[PDB]
Chains A and B, each alone.
Chain A
Amino acid sequence: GAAWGGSYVNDFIDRGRVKKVYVMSEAKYRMLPDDIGDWYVRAADGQMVP
């Protein structure tokens, strides 16, 4: 929900104005059903899982 979605995180301060911070996947990595498998999620021990 924060790769494929784009999650608001908090705000930052640009030029003395309060502006949002969105984590999101890059374009070329959320653009196909094939790019499901490129997302790696951390197990109990810290070995990555596609």
Chain B
Amino acid sequence: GKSNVTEGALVQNGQATALATVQQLDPIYVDVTQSSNDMMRLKQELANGTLKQE
């Protein structure tokens, strides 16, 4: 993407901030935020049950 460092800013041995964020996009994670008791209640219905899976 960018260049968070520029052509001459002193960088250190493993500093805090990145130089540039490389990035791989060809698969992509989607971090999906299930509510707590809902993932609870779905496993609950996988033991009632049935519920099913695929």
Contacts and interface: CB of A to CB of B under 8 A. Distances in A.
Task: Tell me if B's interface is mostly helix, strand, loop or mixed.
Answer: loop
Interface in B1-54: 33, 35, 38
A12 to B, nearest CB: 35
Interface residues of A, number: 3
Interface of A: 37, 48, 50
Nearest to B38: A37
Contacts of B35: 37, 50
5 contacts: A37-B35, A37-B38, A48-B33, A50-B33, A50-B35
A50 B39 CA distance: 13
Nearest to A40: B33
